[PDB]
């Protein structure tokens, strides 16, 4: 399956209207030079890995 693992790089801010959503950058965890910024659901810090169904959508702000 084309599923990805990616470890956090840094926190970016809490977005969306109700602020449940947060922004996070991750490192691809096998291509360290390749990073990606995305949106998440819940409590997050650095140094945690995320299982990604896409590595391309390259999310951005949200309300």
């Amino acid at each position: 399956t084309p599923v990805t693992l990616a470890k956090v790089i840094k926190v970016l801010g809490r977005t969306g209207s109700r602020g449940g959503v947060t922004q996070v950058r991750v490192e691809f965890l096998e291509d360290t030079s390749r990073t990606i910024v995305r949106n998440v659901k819940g409590p997050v810090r650095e140094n945690d890995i995320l299982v990604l169904m896409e590595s391309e959508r390259e999310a951005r702000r949200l309300r």
Binding site: S33, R34, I36, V37, E58
Partner: protein, 97 residues
């Protein structure tokens, strides 16, 4: 009364200036008026430039930019949060930040 001396924008000696059209709403709006900006951008997004140059032949040749002027309606300008009302004294600052 006169909320603004110019009433408007830089006519002051002209009588008539041809109009333009708000790129958002298409309203007619004189060029003296009609907020004017410039949308300078690289086409590429920073998130993509890595894959871009990796796939790019002509290695490190250049990267062009997008150059676009943008007239605006007043109402649109305000609803864009692009321009906004200002304190009375603050209304004469003819500079950006």
């Amino acid at each position: 009364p006169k909320k603004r001396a110019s009433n408007g924008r830089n006519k002051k000696g002209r009588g008539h200036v041809k109009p333009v059209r708000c790129v958002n709403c298409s309203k007619s709006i004189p060029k003296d008026k009609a907020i004017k900006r410039m949308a300078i951008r690289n086409i590429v997004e920073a998130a993509a430039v890595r894959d871009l140059s990796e796939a790019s032949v002509y290695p490190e040749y250049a990267l062009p930019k997008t150059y676009n002027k943008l007239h605006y309606c007043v109402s649109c300008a305000i609803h864009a949060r692009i321009v906004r009302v200002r304190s009375r004294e603050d209304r004469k600052n003819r500079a950006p930040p």
